[PDB]
Amino acid sequence: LVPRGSHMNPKRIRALKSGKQGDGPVVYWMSRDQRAEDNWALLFSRAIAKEANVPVVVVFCLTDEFLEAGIRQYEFMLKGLQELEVSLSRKKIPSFFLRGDPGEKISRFVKDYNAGTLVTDFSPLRIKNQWIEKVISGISIPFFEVDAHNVVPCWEASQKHEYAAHTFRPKLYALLPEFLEEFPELEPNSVTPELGMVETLSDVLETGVKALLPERALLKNKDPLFEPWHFEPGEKAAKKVMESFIADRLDSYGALRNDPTKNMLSNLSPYLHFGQISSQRVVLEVEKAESNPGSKKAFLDEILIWKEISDNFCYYNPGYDGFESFPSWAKESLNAHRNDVRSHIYTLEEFEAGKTHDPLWNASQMELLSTGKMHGYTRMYWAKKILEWSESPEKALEIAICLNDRYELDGRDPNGYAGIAWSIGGVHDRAWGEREVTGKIRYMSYEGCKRKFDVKLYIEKYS
Numbered sequence: 001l002v003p004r005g006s007h008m009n010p011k012r013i014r015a016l017k018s019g020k021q022g023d024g025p026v027v028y029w030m031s032r033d034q035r036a037e038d039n040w041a042l043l044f045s046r047a048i049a050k051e052a053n054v055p056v057v058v059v060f061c062l063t064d065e066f067l068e069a070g071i072r073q074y075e076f077m078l079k080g081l082q083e084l085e086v087s088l089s090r091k092k093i094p095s096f097f098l099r100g101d102p103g104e105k106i107s108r109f110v111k112d113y114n115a116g117t118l119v120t121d122f123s124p125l126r127i128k129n130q131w132i133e134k135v136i137s138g139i140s141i142p143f144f145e146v147d148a149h150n151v152v153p154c155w156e157a158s159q160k161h162e163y164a165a166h167t168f169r170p171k172l173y174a175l176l177p178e179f180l181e182e183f184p185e186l187e188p189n190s191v192t193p194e195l196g197m198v199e200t201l202s203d204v205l206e207t208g209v210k211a212l213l214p215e216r217a218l219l220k221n222k223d224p225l226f227e228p229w230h231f232e233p234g235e236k237a238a239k240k241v242m243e244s245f246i247a248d249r250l251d252s253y254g255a256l257r258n259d260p261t262k263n264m265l266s267n268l269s270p271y272l273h274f275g276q277i278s279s280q281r282v283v284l285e286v287e288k289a290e291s292n293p294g295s296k297k298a299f300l301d302e303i304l305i306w307k308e309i310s311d312n313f314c315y316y317n318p319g320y321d322g323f324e325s326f327p328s329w330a331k332e333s334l335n336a337h338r339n340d341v342r343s344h345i346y347t348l349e350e351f352e353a354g355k356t357h358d359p360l361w362n363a364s365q366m367e368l369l370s371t372g373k374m375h376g377y378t379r380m381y382w383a384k385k386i387l388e389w390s391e392s393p394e395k396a397l398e399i400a401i402c403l404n405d406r407y408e409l410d411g412r413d414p415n416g417y418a419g420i421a422w423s424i425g426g427v428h429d430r431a432w433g434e435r436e437v438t439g440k441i442r443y444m445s446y447e448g449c450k451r452k453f454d455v456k457l458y459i460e461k462y463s
């Protein structure tokens with residue numbers, strides 16, 4: 001059914017719904033992993049199709065709202081998809097396009113297109129679970145899930161929530177020999193569909209990407225400060241970004257990754273978030289590069305351990321966007337400090353506009369507003385001050401999530417929920433010295449940042 005093959009480890013795929021395979025095509029419902037290369041979900045779909053002697057097709061369902069995403073994210077995504085249509089067409093793989101709630105739309109497409117098998121990629125977010133539940137209730141064919149985003153499938157890396165990077169790391173590293181491997185080439189279709197009410201991705205893109213942008217987003221926020229030229233979308237551009245990282249930035253990454261005045265990060269996160277490039281691919285190429293061992297170890301721990309522990313966090317904590325997901329020590333500490341007098345209480349709107357008393361905080365928010373990607377070091381500072389200057393930890397978490405999800409190109413992502421939870425709630429951290437308001441949550445002061453990098457320069461750049 002799912003045939004054996006070179007580099008096709010069956011542990012990457014599991015049945016969401018087992019059943020009777022139909023005579024029709026294999027449909028890959030693409031959602032998280034928007035690429036044609038290095039995509040285990042697409043590769044498995046193609047293998048299932050080959051075994052059944054049917055075509056494989058791809059379908060995508062555009063929702064007009066997604067976790068507070070606006071025009072900046074939808075346009076980045078849709079420009080990517082425009083390129084993807086060409087790549088898929090070159091492999092003779094049809095791509096179809098739906099609009100609305102994927103729950104309803106995907107199950108109806110499965111009926112209308114007479115799919116014999118359904119496959120999707122893996123996301124641990126609540127919204128994907130909700131769509132999947134609805135689809136299952138509406139189909140009568142087998143439905144598989146493939147982890148295309150993680151090197152080690154999320155449900156294999158650990159059977160539970162990992163409290164620390166140091167408990168996850170040995171589990172993950174022990175499984176790299178099995179799962180850190182090259183990808184096979186995607187075989188083009190050899191079987192022709194020749195196949196109403198179904199529009200192709202090509203069809204819907206004939207009048208451009210702008211026509212597809214959600215109306216509700218534009219109306220809610222014109223997004224005047226966004227600068228679209230910092231990150232070009234799509235698989236080709238992602239590859240360029242990875243190659244320039246390796247060539248120009250990787251050697252200095254270990255020394256300078258915590259300095260937000262230096263452009264020494266990979267800049268891969270928007271591409272990784274939309275699955276326009278594979279983290280497994282990135283790891284393979286970094287492993288091959290001759291660079292500083294310190295920098296390689298640091299980079300690999302981020303894209304392997306911290307990225308995959310974020311999927312672990314969301315997968316094993318259904319309330320990952322809530323205070324109750326925090327470790328017990330942190331809930332106890334924040335609870336004990338709930339009635340401490342705050343020095344500042346900012347509204348969502350004040351934080352959003354960068355209108356605090358702290359110019360480093362404001363500059364961090366301006367980097368986010370202007371570029372859609374805040375430096376990783378200042379993201380920690382930024383979220384921690386939202387805790388410090390909100391009425392409650394719950395309110396802080398709500399605000400941090402909202403701004404991250406509204407404005408980061410790489411947001412609405414397990415890495416964001418996990419990073420915000422680390423920052424505000426000590427998830428995957430330890431307790432530090434007790435303070436008013438913030439209790440034992442790790443503190444990051446303005447003066448501490450001044451000691452570590454040129455704060456004045458960062459502020460000037462985003463003024």
Ligand SMILES: Cc1cc2nc3c(=O)[nH]c(=O)nc-3n(C[C@H](O)[C@H](O)[C@H](O)COP(=O)(O)OP(=O)(O)OC[C@H]3O[C@@H](n4cnc5c(N)ncnc54)[C@H](O)[C@@H]3O)c2cc1C
Binds near residue numbers: 272310380411417420
């Ligand atoms: C408050 C807060 C919010 C965050 N929100 C997001 C988010 O919405 N989306 C997002 O992808 N990351 C988020 N992160 C994690 C991290 O800051 C970003 O992944 C990183 O800054 C992206 O830039 P880069 O790809 O140039 O990073 P690089 O340092 O080059 O890292 C390469 C890749 O490794 C992964 N990675 C790196 N650092 C982390 C980390 N700390 N946790 C998890 N994975 C990591 C990412 O996939 C990243 O793209 C957040 C962190 C914090 C503290």
Ligand SMILES: O=c1nc2n(C[C@H](O)[C@H](O)[C@H](O)CO)c3cc(O)ccc3cc-2c(=O)[nH]1
Binds near residue numbers: 077127273
């Ligand atoms: O399948 C979809 N995935 C969309 N995604 C992808 C999202 O990463 C996945 O839907 C989740 O991983 C759950 O599968 C978006 C991601 C963003 O950051 C912003 C907007 C979207 C919109 C959609 C969408 O309309 N349909």
